[PDB]
Subunit: 25 residues, 4 copies
Amino acid sequence: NADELYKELEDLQERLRKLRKKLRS
Amino acid sequence: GNADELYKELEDLQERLRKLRKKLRS
Amino acid sequence: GNADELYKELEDLQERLRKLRKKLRS
Amino acid sequence: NADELYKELEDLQERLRKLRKKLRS
């Protein structure tokens, strides 16, 4: 469903932001 | 620099997911 | 080890996308 | 659309596999 898919995409996007923050650290 | 190049590639993937979310709403 | 830990995290994200593709077909 | 979204997800999955191959190299 569009909402389940949307939530998963946002969680993956947040994980990438967090990995990028770790690369910076 | 490998870390800088990986950081940029991950930013591109992050931005692709941001845009997919926008397309799902559109 | 940072590179090994990054490799595993990227594998998890890759697997999440593989499973999302399966859900789209289901 | 489900097919456009699917194609994008697979391209992101392939990019992650390619980044992992580079981490190994």
